[PDB]
Design a protein around this nucleic acid. Structure first.
Lengths: 149, 58, 19, 30, 129, 82
RNA sequence: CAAGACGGACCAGAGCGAAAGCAUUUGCCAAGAAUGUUUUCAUUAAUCAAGAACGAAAGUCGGAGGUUCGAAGACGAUCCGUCGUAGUUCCGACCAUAAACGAUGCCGACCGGCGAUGCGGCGGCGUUAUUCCCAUGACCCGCCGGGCAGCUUCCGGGAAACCAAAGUCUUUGGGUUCCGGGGGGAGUAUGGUUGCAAAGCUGAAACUUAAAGGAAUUGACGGAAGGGCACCACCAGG
RNA sequence: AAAGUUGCUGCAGUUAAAAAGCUCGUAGUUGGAUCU
């Protein structure tokens, strides 16, 4: 079930059993990696890179073709951000909700949802501190939240 | 064909009334109500429409 | 006399120191 | 209907009866 | 959430057996589940099974035969010293002949008779009669 | 009743089931190749694409994203691929 | 003409929300479930002592406004009526309690049928947008997913009412939280703690008792009600 | 000891004593598959 919602939905992606590249795909691994590099230089999150490569160029799975996932490809070249993209999106949402709250003080629903968001932030920050992605002195603070975005 | 269509529409309406009554009764958890209903179950050309239909004129 | 089912009776709500 | 004491006794007795029947059936296989 | 997939497998098999089904699907597969099913196979309790391999944790389709009365997990995995083993079967088995405590020992996953022959103890996983 | 081979389901049942709940899960989407009406070029487009897909040479909108399957522009030709 | 209040009928078998709750149009703002997905991360999760957010109504402290209703109160009758104080309305602080109900923790698996409904998606002839000039909306058929709610059932369970969970339980172990231990004394005394207050949270013992309680099936029973008959009953009469 | 009226083995918590107003809300308890 959902981590803060009462929903329990099944919807997700289902990978096929064939891990082999299809015969009709003529793109080599380095061409796909060059597309990844120019897309990241356009300023795109790895999720957006995967969606664009799936839709327009027909690359179904980047790891099945190149052998590495998008974040590792961007990391080896060095075009990867300091904080991860899910934590970035959560902190951006928390900043937006806090701005809405400072303009609108009666919205107790917005207060409850902000508490939900920053609890999700605390769980993800604990995970990233445990596996050494974030430095151990990193801490999410309310005023420092907009400074990260 | 169309008669079965009208029959199905009537069936939908009747099932609506029946399911409304069913939910209303299923909310009731009092034992006296269930005991009484158990006792009850164990116990068991036209003038008009067209034009002015009258004596003076039709 | 014992009242019947038709009779209205509502179910009750249950609510020194050692020295 | 009937008290739970002899229902428990009947259930455990019939269970031991299936235990003995399957024991004799499995002993017959040797 | 889902913890102890062996419990889920054994409950699924027991519920399938009580309805008089012949064939049951088990997800997810595991090494411990396959070893337990092989142990029940060698004693002639759950017939035949086949492992469907997708690129996830797999599934198992098991051919039930009819002899099995109750297969069950024991959670948590209690340590079974070789003396204590005797007590354990008097707690779980309805007789001293049939039924099976399954132990994981350093000699493998096996039943209590074979663990007594190999003279070793381990963690209790279940029982089936 | 109570007698069927779970190991060998028929194509109609395995097609009918949810994409995760099959014997082995498999997607329902596909990659299809599209010819623009104003050109001859081949574009490989995901069936459930979330991005609007422009022609690399003509810059004509091939498909518009919807809730499920993508909505092709009228005039475009498409073929199922692989 | 004005002031405050409130959004009926449509309005449900509906929907949304963590709960309390939520019904005039329009615009803005920031959230959200489900669905779809050959995106990404790759165990990041489940459950709660501590601590914190929200919490109907009534209530308390400052303002504003006071149409209706209205605790108290003044009158008139003898559970009602006239007038109407605090309040009910808005803003800012508190209080944190309800039959705050499914008198029914949360997360996970397995285990019958049916045809209805809300949202999303997929496939498909047809009718419609005064035969619509292709799509699109509205209907129609079927399927899939997460829902709300029914009917049915020797799945099993229960003391029974009944429950598709209140099942998979003496054949007794998926994970974890709160909590009861005969009836009273008694939510009392005492101490602590929160609160401006009203009160809230925590909470005994001495003693006393043989019961307390839950579920269901039932004869007789002075009577009571619906009818019918009779000039040894009645109306009008002799 | 009977007693499964202290219940780890091994009780219960709709209607009998009993599930917290509700959810975010650290510690402690539990944690998917995989390496001969």
């Amino acid at each position: 079930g959902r981590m803060h919602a009462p929903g329990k939905g099944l919807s997700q992606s289902a990978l096929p059993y064939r891990r082999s590249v299809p015969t009709w795909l003529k793109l080599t691994s380095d061409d796909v990696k060059e597309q990844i590099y120019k897309l990241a230089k356009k300023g795109l999150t790895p999720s957006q890179i995967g969606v664009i490569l799936r839709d327009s160029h027909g690359v179904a799975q980047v790891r099945f073709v190149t052998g590495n996932k998008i974040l590792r490809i961007l990391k080896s070249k060095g075009l990867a951000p300091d904080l991860p993209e899910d934590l970035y999106h959560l902190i951006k949402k928390a900043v937006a909700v806090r701005k809405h709250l400072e303009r609108n003080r009666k919205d107790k629903d917005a207060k409850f949802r902000l508490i939900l968001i920053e609890s999700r932030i605390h769980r993800l920050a604990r995970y990233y501190k445990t596996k050494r992605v974030l430095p151990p002195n990193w801490k999410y603070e309310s005023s420092t939240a907009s400074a990260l975005v | 064909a169309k008669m079965r269509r009208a029959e199905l529409q009537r069936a939908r309406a009747l099932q609506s009334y029946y399911e409304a009554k069913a939910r209303r009764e299923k909310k009731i958890k009092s034992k006296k109500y269930h005991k009484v209903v158990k006792k009850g179950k164990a116990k068991k050309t036209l003038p008009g429409w067209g034009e002015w239909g009258g004596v003076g004129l039709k | 006399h014992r009242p019947g089912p038709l009779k209205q009776q509502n179910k009750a709500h249950k609510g020194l120191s050692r020295v | 209907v009937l008290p739970k004491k002899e229902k428990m006794k009947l259930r455990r007795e019939q269970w031991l009866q299936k235990i003995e029947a399957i024991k004799l059936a499995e002993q017959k296989h040797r | 959430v889902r913890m102890n997939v062996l419990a889920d497998a054994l409950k699924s098999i027991n519920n399938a057996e009580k309805r008089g089904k012949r064939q049951v699907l088990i997800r997810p597969c595991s090494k411990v589940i396959v070893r337990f099913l092989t142990v029940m196979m060698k004693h002639g309790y759950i017939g035949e099974f086949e492992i469907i391999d997708d690129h996830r944790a797999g599934k198992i389709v098991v051919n039930l035969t009819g002899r099995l009365n109750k297969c069950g997990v024991i959670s948590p995995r209690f340590d079974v010293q070789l003396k204590d083993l005797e007590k354990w079967q008097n707690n779980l088995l309805p007789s001293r002949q049939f039924g099976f405590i399954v132990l994981t020992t350093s000699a493998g996953i096996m039943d209590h008779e074979e663990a007594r022959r190999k003279h070793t103890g381990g963690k209790i996983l279940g029982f089936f009669f | 009743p109570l007698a069927k081979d779970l190991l060998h389901p028929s194509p109609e049942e395995e097609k009918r089931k949810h994409k995760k709940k099959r014997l082995v899960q498999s997607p329902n989407s596909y990659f299809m190749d599209v010819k623009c009406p104003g050109c001859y070029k081949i574009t490989t487009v995901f069936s459930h694409a979330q991005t609007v897909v422009l022609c690399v040479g003509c810059s004509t909108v091939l498909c518009q994203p919807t809730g499920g399957k993508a909505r092709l522009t009228e005039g475009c030709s498409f073929r199922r691929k692989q």
